[PDB]
Amino acid sequence: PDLLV
Amino acid sequence: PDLLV
Amino acid sequence: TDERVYESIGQYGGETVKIVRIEKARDIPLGATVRNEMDSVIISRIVKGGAAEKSGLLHEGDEVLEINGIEIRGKDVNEVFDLLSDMHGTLTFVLIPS
Amino acid sequence: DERVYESIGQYGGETVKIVRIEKARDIPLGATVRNEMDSVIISRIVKGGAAEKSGLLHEGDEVLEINGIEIRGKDVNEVFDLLSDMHGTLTFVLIPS
Amino acid sequence: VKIVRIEKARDIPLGATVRNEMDSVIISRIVKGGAAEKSGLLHEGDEVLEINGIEIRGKDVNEVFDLLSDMHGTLTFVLIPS
């Protein structure tokens, strides 16, 4: 999954 | 120890 | 002499209840740290630049009675964190300012 | 005879964008990131986040640098850590889509 | 007949230019990097029959622009591909 940041 | 929320 | 009457002892003007609405983005915190004082939940800090700070409706000192029809008073701050993590859009806050 | 076919393979280059966005301590910018090869690409802009309101961060931009730190060629788990300890005006060096 | 859903933000274009051919509204180009290109559900050559319960076939190219400019969220497209 893509990380928030 | 005070949660961000 | 005979009858001395001292009225209005212990007079109080009551408390204010504030009903405000703040926008919250999915998984982006409002920017307000909370602590538990007895049963009630109290805002202890307002994060510099957060959604709460910009709105100007949430303050260091307020009591959180309710958030989006959910009783916050008498809940652990770990539960308020969980309730808030799954929230987005207009959140209606029922508060008792300091 | 001589037939000349000029300008074949012409290209107008890429644009480099240098923008500044405010970040609050421990409050995320509201932009999901993915790694495409070495580079770091913004995949989503969260509705209502600091990046959406500013209008300077977009779904598709490449992040070359953030506050003098090379982002291209770093794992997204490292960009997450670098960003978690950031606040104030963050300068972004980007290559828009 | 293709029935697809493509997200759009308020005042942010999908990236799909429209061409008129008689009564029917057509899509002529798909903008590089737009919400119509990255989704893969809108193509150069398809016919737009309806968008969010509104008849697009038989409408001017300027009316389809106005209808779309006031749209946001999930947009349901009824199409006839090329």
Numbering used by the authors:
A (entry chain C): 169 to 173
B (entry chain D): 354 to 358
C (entry chain B): 2 to 99
D (entry chain A): 3 to 99
E (entry chain E): 18 to 99
Source paper text:
The crystal structure of the MPP5-PDZ in complex with SARS-CoV-2-E-PBM was solved at a resolution of 2.80 Å. Each domain adopts a compact globular PDZ fold, and an electron density was observed for the last five residues of the peptide in two MPP5-PDZs present in the asymmetric unit. As for MLLT4, the E PBM conventionally binds to the MPP5-PDZ. In addition, the amide and carbonyl groups of Leu at position -2 form hydrogen bonds with the carbonyl and amide proton of valine 271, respectively. Interestingly, as for MLLT4, a hydrogen bond is also formed between the carboxyl at the end of the side chain of Asp at position -3 of the PBM and the hydroxyl group of Ser 281 of the β3 strand. The alternative hydrogen bond with Ser 281 identified in our structure was previously reported in the complex formed by MPP5-PDZ and the PBM peptide of Crumbs. Furthermore, the side chain of Phe 318 in α2 helix, which prevents access to the binding groove in the unbound form, is located out of the binding groove in our structure allowing SARS-CoV-2-E-PBM peptide binding as previously stated for MPP5-PDZ in complex with SARS-CoV-1 E and SARS-CoV-2 E PBMs, as well as for Crumbs peptides.
PBMs are mainly located at the C-terminus of target proteins and interact directly with PDZ domains.
